[PDB]
């Protein structure tokens, strides 16, 4: 009985929390109390299998019993279930209450307080890494335990809760790229990404060892993205124990991680810094360019030889990004398919490493260009610059999505331009790949752009260059200027700097959608007249009045220019 075995392995609480997540990720609209009762029925059924492992369904797999409880055939059943996981659920914005109201619920029933936390997050991020969600609940609880007894509860609690919100969004977007990598482009593309990421991380490890961890890693994320959260949880547990047992053959940075408890150990290993490179590392010319078995290896063992090139290039260059490395490996691949059918193969592929200089500088120049711009403008205005830029690229994308994606795109400047000039590319470009997958999955629910569909579906490694090479769209028909977007009320003066800037930025998109050929300096004139307008009328004694009257004036000047 797999269900009685899993229940005795985890205990009731941890068994219930992962079943709660699994339901919340699938049934994203049912209320909390209905999920709780659904979890209790699966828990009460697991206790009858402990008593008598020969009962009604104790021989069925827990994955099968979950769909059995879901309906109230395989493997098409789960595959059909997976098509109805909503990336943009129509749910209310999570408005967290007063600090004293949250601390009252936290002290009244802490076990339920955290279940609603798990429920509210999982129902909004149906691909959240379930083991990491459990870790987030531990830190969420830790902040309430400390701050509800602090002298200033809100000064303690709110900053910590804001950090978890930001960290949870990043975790959801990283894991969603992983799941989309598997579902859309296959496990073959996920293994390629993991071999390059792990070769950067564990340069001491052998190709067979990195390939072994990638097979285990592909199963952990297959289960967490295909719904078996309890097998995902145990598989990443086994992988942390295996990585710590064999750490001497993998990495020297794991010793600190391996002394920690299960949740923190698995987390520590995922966040571990790169290991030092072995000193006695040859140049890649020897075995891949100058060797005499290059076309024989490519012909005889294509996947091991090419995956060996990626591994060997990735561990030598942790200052490259994973998408840059996968591009280098594909270039080397296509050069050998061309060159190995030639007269003298060595006479043509002798200069293969010369085609990598273009591919490596192209992201370098883009990042230096954007970091240079971010130093001048700053986060808010850098986002405005990208908002203009990407609204001109794909104006069919909805205004909420254009604002969200562009704001995130502008956070790469704050995140990655504080790093030394050589550590910028992995930070920048791998984050850009994560934000563009946000746009790719929000646009795949309701496709409105042929270009976005094009960049998202064509490849997965060339997504950032695809979008970056996009010019202003000519096919787009300007939006009829609606003045309902540029007339605000006095409520804007009680908003946060963030929420207010989102309102300003939401105008900028609807402005560009109307005038897709406006100059970048012309669009900055309106926005500068915009900000002076909101500042003035929020200072006025009669705020409601001059928002109406001076608002009309500001609309006239913008339309006139």
């Amino acid at each position: 009985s797999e269900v009685a075995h899993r229940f005795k392995d985890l205990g009731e609480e941890n068994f219930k929390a992962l079943v709660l997540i699994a339901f919340a990720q699938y049934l994203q609209q049912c209320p909390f109390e209905d999920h709780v009762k659904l979890v209790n029925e699966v828990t009460e059924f697991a206790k009858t299998c402990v008593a008598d492992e020969s009962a009604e369904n104790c021989d069925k797999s827990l994955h099968t019993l979950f769909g059995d409880k879901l309906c109230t055939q395989e493997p098409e059943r789960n595959e059909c279930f997976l098509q109805h996981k909503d990336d943009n659920p129509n749910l209310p914005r999570l408005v967290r209450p007063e600090v004293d109201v949250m601390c009252t619920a936290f002290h009244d029933n802490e076990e339920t307080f955290l279940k609603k936390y798990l429920y509210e997050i999982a129902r909004r991020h149906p691909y959240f890494y379930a083991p990491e969600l459990l870790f987030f609940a531990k830190r969420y609880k830790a902040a309430f335990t400390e701050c509800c007894q602090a002298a200033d509860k809100a000064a303690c609690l709110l900053p910590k809760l804001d950090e978890l919100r930001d960290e949870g969004k990043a975790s959801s977007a990283k894991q969603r790229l992983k799941c989309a990598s598997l579902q859309k482009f296959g496990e073959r593309a996920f293994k390629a990404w993991a071999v390059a990421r792990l070769s950067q991380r564990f340069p001491k490890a052998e190709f067979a060892e990195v390939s072994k961890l990638v097979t285990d890693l592909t199963k952990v994320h297959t289960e967490c993205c295909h719904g078996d959260l309890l097998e995902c949880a145990d598989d990443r547990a086994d992988l942390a124990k295996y990585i710590c047992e064999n750490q001497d053959s993998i990495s020297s940075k794991l010793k600190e991680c391996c002394e920690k408890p299960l949740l923190e150990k698995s987390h520590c290993i995922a966040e571990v810094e790169n290991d030092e490179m072995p000193a006695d590392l040859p140049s890649l010319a020897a075995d891949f360019v100058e060797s005499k078995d290059v076309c024989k290896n490519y012909a005889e063992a294509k996947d091991v030889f090419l995956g060996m090139f990626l591994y060997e290039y990735a561990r030598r260059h942790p200052d490259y990004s994973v998408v840059l490395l996968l591009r280098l490996a594909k270039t080397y691949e296509t050069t050998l398919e061309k060159c190995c059918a030639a007269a003298d193969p060595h006479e043509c592929y002798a200069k293969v490493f010369d085609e990598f200089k273009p591919l490596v500088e192209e992201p370098q120049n883009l990042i230096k260009q954007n970091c240079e711009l971010f130093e001048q403008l700053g986060e808010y205005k850098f986002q405005n610059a990208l908002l203009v830029r990407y609204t001109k690229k794909v104006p069919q994308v909805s205004t909420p999505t254009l604002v969200e994606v562009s704001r995130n795109l502008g956070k790469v400047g704050s995140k990655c331009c504080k790093h030394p000039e050589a550590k910028r590319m992995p930070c920048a470009e791998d984050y850009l790949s994560v934000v563009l997958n946000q746009l790719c999955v929000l646009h795949e629910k309701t496709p409105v752009s042929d270009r976005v569909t094009k960049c998202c579906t064509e490849s997965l490694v060339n997504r950032r260059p695809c979008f970056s090479a996009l010019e202003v769209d000519e096919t787009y028909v300007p939006k009829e200027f609606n003045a309902e977007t540029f007339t605000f009320h006095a409520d804007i003066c009680t908003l946060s700097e963030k929420e207010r800037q989102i309102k300003k930025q939401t105008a900028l998109v609807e402005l560009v959608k109307h005038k897709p050929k406006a100059t970048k300096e012309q669009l900055k004139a309106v926005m500068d007249d915009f900000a002076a307008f909101v500042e003035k009328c929020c200072k006025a004694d009669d705020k409601e009045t001059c928002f109406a009257e001076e608002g009309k004036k500001l609309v006239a000047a913008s339309q006139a220019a």
Epitope: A208, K212, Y242, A301
Partner: antibody, heavy 119, light 109 residues
Framework: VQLVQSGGGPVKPGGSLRLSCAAS????????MNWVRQAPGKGLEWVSS????????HYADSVKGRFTISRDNAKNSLYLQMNSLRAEDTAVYYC?????????????WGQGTLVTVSS | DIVLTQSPGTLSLSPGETATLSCRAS??????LAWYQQKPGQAPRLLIY???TGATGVPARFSGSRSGTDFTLTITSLQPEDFATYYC??????????FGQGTQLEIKR
């Protein structure tokens, strides 16, 4: 995928032998190679294991100090130097290949070589 | 080094029956456990790797399973060429690869 073994035979106690494994049919330079032995009528015993580049080498406690594993990646060959041979080292010795990405299981074995340590 | 203990030493069954072989690990080895089949005079042959995943070409009546530190190899529609000796091997330990003592399938007549 071939693992052609060579070099066993009889020796006297304390003597030396050198086992060879000539591989072909796969990118030998990417796989870890193993030596497994089986005494006549007994079970499998793991002897040594060498990684792709030869960086990580492991021995069973029984042969620690006497056996030395090595490989020539240019010649696609695996070697086992057996010194200070004992009568308990009498067995059929197999060179096995590790799975490249399925773990450290042994998917291809050689035909085996018989080593008899007797006076 | 982790000790793998196989049971039983010998299994006497008739063709068509189901064989159930045991391999008990002294410590947890995760799913880093392989099954091998060996016929007289032949080199071992990989059957199962990763505790449950069967090797390419292995028929479907061979099925491995893990429950904690106890591993089971099950052969369901025993054919005459399924009768051989079977060994389990772990590859979790950093220090050594250890095998089991082996279990022999014998045709009961």
């Amino acid at each position: 995928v071939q693992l052609v073994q060579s070099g066993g035979g009889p020796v006297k106690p304390g003597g030396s032998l050198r086992l060879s494994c000539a591989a072909s049919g796969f990118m030998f330079r990417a796989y870890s190679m193993n030596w497994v032995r089986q005494a006549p009528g007994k079970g499998l015993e793991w002897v040594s294991s060498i990684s792709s580049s030869g960086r990580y080498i492991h021995y069973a406690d029984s042969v620690k100090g006497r056996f030395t594993i090595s490989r020539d990646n240019a010649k696609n060959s695996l070697y086992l130097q057996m010194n200070s041979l004992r009568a308990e080292d009498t067995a059929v010795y197999y060179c096995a290949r590790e799975t490249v990405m399925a773990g450290k299981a042994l998917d291809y074995w050689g035909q085996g070589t018989l080593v008899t340590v007797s006076s | 080094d982790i000790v793998l203990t196989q049971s039983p030493g010998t299994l006497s069954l008739s063709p068509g029956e189901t064989a159930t072989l045991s391999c008990r690990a002294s410590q947890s080895v995760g799913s880093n456990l392989a099954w091998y089949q060996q016929k007289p005079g032949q080199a071992p042959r990989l059957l199962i790797y990763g505790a449950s995943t069967g090797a390419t070409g292995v028929p479907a009546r061979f099925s491995g399973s893990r429950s904690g530190t106890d591993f089971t190899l099950t052969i369901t529609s025993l054919q005459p060429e399924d009768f051989a000796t079977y060994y389990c091997q772990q590859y979790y330990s950093f220090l050594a690869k250890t095998f089991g003592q082996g279990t022999q399938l014998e045709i009961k007549r």
